[PDB]
Amino acid sequence: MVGLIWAQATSGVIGRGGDIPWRLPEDQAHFREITMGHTIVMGRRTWDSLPAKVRPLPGRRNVVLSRQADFMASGAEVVGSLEEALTSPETWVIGGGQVYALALPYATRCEVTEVDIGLPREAGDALAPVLDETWRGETGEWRFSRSGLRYRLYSYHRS
Amino acid sequence: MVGLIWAQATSGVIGRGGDIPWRLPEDQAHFREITMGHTIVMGRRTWDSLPAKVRPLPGRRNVVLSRQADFMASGAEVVGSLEEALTSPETWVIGGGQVYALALPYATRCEVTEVDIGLPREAGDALAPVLDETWRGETGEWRFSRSGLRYRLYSYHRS
Numbered sequence: 001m002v003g004l005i006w007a008q009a010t011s012g013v014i015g016r017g018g019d020i021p022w023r024l025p026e027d028q029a030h031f032r033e034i035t036m037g038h039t040i041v042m043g044r045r046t047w048d049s050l051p052a053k054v055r056p057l058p059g060r061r062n063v064v065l066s067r068q069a070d071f072m073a074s075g076a077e078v079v080g081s082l083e084e085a086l087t088s089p090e091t092w093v094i095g096g097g098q099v100y101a102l103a104l105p106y107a108t109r110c111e112v113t114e115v116d117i118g119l120p121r122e123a124g125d126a127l128a129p130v131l132d133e134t135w136r137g138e139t140g141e142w143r144f145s146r147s148g149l150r151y152r153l154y155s156y157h158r159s
Numbered sequence: 160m161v162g163l164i165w166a167q168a169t170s171g172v173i174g175r176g177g178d179i180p181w182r183l184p185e186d187q188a189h190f191r192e193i194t195m196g197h198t199i200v201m202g203r204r205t206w207d208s209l210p211a212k213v214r215p216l217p218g219r220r221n222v223v224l225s226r227q228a229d230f231m232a233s234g235a236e237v238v239g240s241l242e243e244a245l246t247s248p249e250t251w252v253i254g255g256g257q258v259y260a261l262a263l264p265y266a267t268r269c270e271v272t273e274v275d276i277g278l279p280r281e282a283g284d285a286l287a288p289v290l291d292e293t294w295r296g297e298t299g300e301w302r303f304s305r306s307g308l309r310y311r312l313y314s315y316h317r318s
């Protein structure tokens with residue numbers, strides 16, 4: 001099973017300046033629950049965004065996509081193509097924009113946290129992938145995060 | 160990955176008299192999308208409840224649990240224990256009450272449809288398993304079916 005998991009503003013922005021312009025603890029907890037124990041695949045730019053003290057993310061097989069044959073990611077496996085990372089029962093692609101678009105053909109699940117933040121898209125932003133009509137979505141109820149922003153969870157699925 | 164999928168009344172009833180006592184087309188489409196392409200595992204009574212012209216379910220590896228050593232199910236593998244049935248990257252246990260209870264200790268996901276009909280538990284009814292604290296799931300919003308029933312979807316998981 002290949003799944004994608006991400007949080008986006010209502011505009012579709014997922015990242016800016018190489019980081020993320022919000023932080024919802026409830027989203028962090030949902031991310032940990034869904035990914036724990038499984039393979040996580042991230043792009044090199046996303047690995048670079050994690051502080052060394054928190055990486056690799058515990059209890060998961062950390063995999064980083066890079067075109068650099070000598071790039072070293074301490075605590076992770078570095079692979080030059082996405083297909084080499086798909087050897088577990090369950091694989092979660094955790095970002096960022098480039099790797100979501102690369103992995104979408106392999107994916108059957110999309111776990112989306114929509115953040116109710118008014119964040120118009122700007123040049124250089126990373127964006128969530130566009131989901132065509134093959135994806136069936138089940139929407140959650142708008143919830144309040146202790147950070148003060150509302151959020152809702154989406155579960156998209158396709159055979 | 161071993162998942163369970165079922166549709167229940169609020170009371171927990173999933174079946175009566177060899178039948179499912181409602182019609183909810185959206186749930187069938189949901190069930191078809193989640194199980195398609197994968198192994199599906201079902202108890203002998205649930206196999207017997209499918210008219211011959213509908214079984215085996217298309218596009219899926221149909222497995223039937225029975226204690227009858229010489230039980231044949233044209234179009235399905237017959238196995239004598241749940242563990243025999245579990246094999247692929249992804250297996251869905253699709254009923255009924257006896258098989259759900261047998262399979263829950265091996266499950267990491269439950270996909271539940273709750274049907275808002277006041278269907279009380281009568282003796283002999285097949286029941287959904289009750290999920291404890293260790294099962295976390297986003298409650299879906301209520302929806303309205305073209306059958307006239309209100310329903311909602313839960314996606315439970317445990318790490």
Ligand SMILES: NC(=O)C1=CN([C@@H]2O[C@H](COP(=O)(O)OP(=O)(O)OC[C@H]3O[C@@H](n4cnc5c(N)ncnc54)[C@H](OP(=O)(O)O)[C@@H]3O)[C@@H](O)[C@H]2O)C=CC1
Pocket residue numbers: 005006007008014015016017018019020042043044045046047049065066067068071079080081082094095096097098099100102126
């Ligand atoms: N849920 C959310 O909101 C999330 C947001 N983000 C955000 O996303 C942003 C980063 O995303 P983005 O900029 O798109 O970068 P990515 O994280 O997608 O990483 C891009 C890098 O991946 C490698 N790569 C890309 N395509 C290939 C390929 N075909 N083969 C091999 N390697 C490949 C390259 O590494 P190299 O240069 O080494 O070759 C490339 O530079 C950040 O702002 C981050 O904070 C991240 C994850 C989650």
Ligand SMILES: NC(=O)C1=CN([C@@H]2O[C@H](COP(=O)(O)OP(=O)(O)OC[C@H]3O[C@@H](n4cnc5c(N)ncnc54)[C@H](OP(=O)(O)O)[C@@H]3O)[C@@H](O)[C@H]2O)C=CC1
Pocket residue numbers: 164165166167173174175176177178179201202203204205206208224225226227230238239240241253254255256257258259261285
């Ligand atoms: N989502 C829903 O609403 C669903 C509803 N249903 C309903 O559920 C009902 C059927 O459920 P239920 O009566 O509980 O029966 P099951 O479908 O669970 O089948 C029971 C049979 O499974 C076999 N079996 C049970 N335990 C084991 C074991 N440990 N090892 C091997 N084989 C075993 C036995 O077959 P044998 O006797 O041959 O040995 C037993 O009779 C029907 O009304 C059906 O419509 C069904 C599926 C889904």
Ligand SMILES: Nc1nc(N)c(C#CC2CC2)c(-c2ccccc2F)n1
Pocket residue numbers: 005006007020022023024027028029031032046049050093094095111112113
């Ligand atoms: N829903 C969802 N999906 C995700 N892939 C991520 C990620 C990531 C990359 C490891 C950095 C997050 C997330 C965002 C901000 C803070 C904490 C988080 F877990 N949230």
Ligand SMILES: Nc1nc(N)c(C#CC2CC2)c(-c2ccccc2F)n1
Pocket residue numbers: 164165166179186187189190191205209252253254270271272
């Ligand atoms: N959600 C969910 N889970 C399930 N296991 C099942 C089943 C089954 C056994 C094949 C009969 C259904 C379902 C219910 C009524 C009609 C069609 C359906 F697919 N729905």
Ligand SMILES: [Co+2]
Pocket residue numbers: 108158159192193194195196197
């Ligand atoms: Co599937």
Ligand SMILES: [Co+2]
Pocket residue numbers: 033034035036037038267316317318
């Ligand atoms: Co899991």
